[PDB]
């Protein structure tokens, strides 16, 4: 699987809610770093963080506007949409850098966005 195909599939798994397929595309030592926050180091810690972030989320609808790769690094421009438990929807504009390991799994995922845009929507 090429890096672009891997990241494309990763996003599709978020969108379908196939969380295990999502994790399976990641290295065991994946670092998930939402840039304004502390990095999350390793798949076990990623599972716990995802559980927290998804607690009040019923569905994801993440749209890739642009994607480009340079070797093992894949860059994205996205709008990440969510539907919350009560049916409210929100979107956050984000760019992400993904790095793939020697096994072509995601070993780093760094997302860049405005913390205020995030806090507005994930408050309450």
Ligand X SMILES: CCCC(CCC)C(N)=O
Can you tell me the distance from the alpha carbon of 101 to that of 56, in angstroms, rounded to the nearest whole number? 32
Work out which of 6, 26, 80, 100 binds ligand X, going by CB under 6 A: 80
Residue nearest to ligand X (CB): 80
Interface region with ligand X, contact rule CB under 6 A, candidates 5-13, 66-74, 83-91, 111-119 = 111-119
Using CB under 6 A as the binding rule, whether residue 92 contacts ligand X is answered as yes
For ligand X, the closer of residues 52 and 71 by Cβ is 52
The site string for ligand X over 46-65 (x = CB under 6 A, - otherwise) reads -------x------------
Q: Which residues contact 85 (CB under 8 A, 6 or more apart)?
A: 56, 57, 58
Question: 40-41 and 26-34 as β-strands: parallel, antiparallel, unpaired?
Answer: antiparallel
Smallest separation, CB 57 to ligand X (Å): 7
Q: Which residues contact 14 (CB under 8 A, 6 or more apart)?
A: 22, 60, 62
Q: Which residue has the tokens 């559980």?
A: 51
Residue 48, number of CB atoms within 10 A of its CB:
12
Contact residues toward ligand X (CB under 6 A) are: 34, 53, 80, 92, 94, 111, 113, 118
């Amino acid at each position: 699987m090429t890096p672009i195909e891997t990241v494309t599939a990763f996003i599709a798994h978020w969108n379908s809610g196939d969380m295990e397929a999502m994790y399976d595309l990641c290295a065991e030592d994946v670092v998930w770093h939402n840039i304004p926050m502390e990095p999350i180091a390793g798949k076990p810690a990623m599972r716990a963080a995802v559980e927290g972030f998804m607690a009040n989320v019923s569905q994801c609808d993440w749209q890739v506007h642009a994607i480009a790769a340079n070797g093992a690094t894949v860059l994205t421009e996205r709008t990440d949409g969510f539907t919350f438990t009560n049916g409210r929807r929100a979107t956050i504009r984000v760019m992400g850098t993904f790095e793939c390991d020697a096994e072509r799994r995601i070993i780093a995922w760094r997302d860049y966005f405005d913390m205020l845009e995030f806090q507005r929507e994930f408050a309450g």
